[PDB]
TrEMBL record, chain B:
This is Type II and III secretion system protein. The chain holds residues 152 to 201 of 502 of the full protein. The lineage of its organism: Bacteria, Pseudomonadati, Pseudomonadota, Acidithiobacillia, Acidithiobacillales. Belongs to the bacterial secretin family.
Length: 50, 50
């Protein structure tokens, strides 16, 4: 699974709190399933597979 | 000195025509139509040596 880490964007102030970052993570394209499976609201480390 | 007639009385012909046509057709569409092309597995790798 992917990793969830804290990151600081480049060009941001050094005093602001960090935001949510990630390691290597893949969002695959769905050819004929596009629009049928929700990817925007899917927690990446997948809990619930079926 | 003989002269012809203004016209010759021809024979009259009666025509009887019959046209008959019959058309029949069937159309069936039954079963279950599944998907035949679905996404496959994915793998990615990333690293910074320096």
């Amino acid at each position: 699974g992917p990793r969830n880490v804290a990151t600081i964007p480049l060009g941001q102030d050094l005093t602001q709190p960090p935001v949510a970052g990630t390691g290597v993570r893949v969002t695959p394209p769905l050819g004929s399933l596009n629009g049928a499976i929700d990817l925007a609201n899917l927690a990446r480390p997948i809990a619930g597979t079926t | 000195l003989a002269t012809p007639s203004p016209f010759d009385m021809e024979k009259m012909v009666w025509l009887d025509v019959n046209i008959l046509e019959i058309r029949k057709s069937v159309l069936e569409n039954f079963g279950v139509d599944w998907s035949k092309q679905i996404p496959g597995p994915f793998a990615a790798f990333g690293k910074d040596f320096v």
